[PDB]
C-alpha cells in the first residue's frame, strides 16, 4: 500500500508532469507552463506570486540555471525544496509553545 | 484551497513530525524514530530497507552529517530529495515511449 509519504512524492512528480507535457519538451516547464503551475498549484504558498507576474519572472530566471528558458525537473525541485524548508519554518512559527492549546494555521 | 502540490509539501512535514515528536528532541528523528518512519512510510519506495536493518544503519549514518545520532529536518530531507529524483527516474523507465499504450507502474 502507498503511504502518505509515498503519495506526496508521487503527487509532486505527477503535478510537475501535468504542466511539463503541455508544450515544448514534455519533461521541462516553459515560462507559460511554470506560471500556469505556480498560479494553479502554489496559490496559497505563493499568494503574492500568483497575482504579481513580476515575481514569477524573477523566480523563473533564478531557477533556470543553464539559461535555456525552461525548467528541468532538477531546476524546478530547487523551488520545491525552498518551499518545504520555508513551510517547515513557518509551521514552527505558527505553533508557539507554552500557550496550553493547539494551533491550526499550518504554513503559508 | 490547498492544491495537491500544497498538500504534498504539508504531508511531508506532517509525516516527519509524526515520528520526530515521539522521543528525545521533538524536531529530530532518533534511530528508533527514523527506522519506525522508514518501515511505516517508505515500505514500497524502500522495500529492501524495511526488512534489511543493515541498510537503515547505513542510511542513518550517511544522513547524520553532524554526528549527533539524530536526524534534523534538514538532514532527513536529503533522503526525501534522493527519493523524489529516484522516483522521477524510475517513472520514466517504467513508461517507455513508442508502445502505443499507457503504463501504470509509477515508481518503486
Ligand atoms: Ca514543456
Ligand atoms: Ca533550464
Ligand atoms: Ca525525536
Ligand atoms: Ca544530526
Ligand atoms: Na529528467
Ligand atoms: Na528545524
Ligand atoms: Zn519527468
Ligand atoms: Zn496560542
Ligand atoms: Zn519541525
Ligand atoms: Zn508497453
Curated annotation (Swiss-Prot), chains A, B:
UniProt-listed Gene3D superfamilies: EF-hand
GO MF annotation: an example: antioxidant activity
Keyword Zinc tagged: yes
GO biological process: actin cytoskeleton organization; apoptotic process; astrocyte development; autophagy; innate immune response; leukocyte chemotaxis; leukocyte migration involved in inflammatory response; neutrophil aggregation
Ranges for domain EF-hand: 9-44, 51-86
Primary residence: secreted
Species this chain originates from: Mus musculus (Mouse)
Lineage: Eukaryota, Metazoa, Chordata, Craniata, Vertebrata
Binding site for Ca(2+) 1: 20, 25, 28, 33
A Pfam family: S_100
Name this protein carries in UniProt: Protein S100-A9
Record-linked PROSITE patterns: EF_HAND_2 (PS50222), S100_CABP (PS00303)
Membrane protein topology class: Peripheral membrane protein
